[PDB]
Amino acid sequence: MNNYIFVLSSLFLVGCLGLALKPSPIYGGLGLIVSGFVGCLMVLGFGGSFLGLMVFLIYLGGMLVVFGYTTAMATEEYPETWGSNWLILGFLVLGVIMEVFLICVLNYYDEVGVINLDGLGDWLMYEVDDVGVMLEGGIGVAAMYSCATWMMVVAGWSLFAGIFIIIEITR
């Protein structure tokens, strides 16, 4: 259980690939949800819980509205999923092939430094504090209320002004 993180990273890569091929926003948003779940899992793998869970929550809440809108504006009579186009299917398969081939290549052009398949799982956590408390994420994010009280102001203003911006664009 050492190639866990490489597997998760490659699945995120594949998700963003199928996203970039731009099928209907339904399957596109499905890819977003899969990739956000995978990102949450790898952030957990690096010792981060709150950030991953918030990724998943926020992207779920966004993709819900995306479904609502795409059923209203970005819909066709034939939504054109991945396999509908032999060309897009070929680009997907070629992207996976090039992923494998380029990883095999970067595993050869340099011993280590870019991609390390022989040494894998040895470099994830980098000096944990084996004795600790008040150490998780959530303390840093809660520093927006103390020692980082500018980020909170500026994001709050962003959202507040966004409300008015949306009302006026839709008016």
Partner: protein
């Protein structure tokens, strides 16, 4: 910056969490705190072009603490040689590397 208002007023809106060695919430040192501190204290009073050549040892030490490439290459070489020996029938690992030791405490 362009409009150094914070210095003109003394406040620090964002210039107290620029780098790693800067006041984490509960006093937990970020790794390479010592190296970044050393680089930043060598490159002070100096600016730029001279600190880029008079504090290069400290920047190299920091770059090796943070991105940590030479240790990767070193352990890779060691494991390569070990695999070669074990396939040549020359090296056997000891008890405390195959999972059979007397744990210390």
């Amino acid at each position: 910056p362009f409009l150094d208002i914070q210095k003109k007023l003394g406040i620090s809106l964002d210039r107290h969490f620029m780098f790693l060695s800067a006041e984490q919430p509960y006093k937990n040192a970020a790794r390479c705190h010592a190296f970044e501190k050393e680089w930043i204290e060598c490159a002070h009073g100096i600016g730029g072009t001279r600190a880029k050549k008079e504090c290069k040892i400290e920047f190299d030490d920091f770059e090796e603490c943070l991105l940590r490439y030479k240790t990767m290459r070193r352990m890779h070489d060691i494991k390569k040689q070990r695999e070669k020996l074990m396939k040549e029938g020359k090296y056997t690992p000891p008890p405390h590397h195959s999972g059979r030791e007397e744990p210390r405490p």
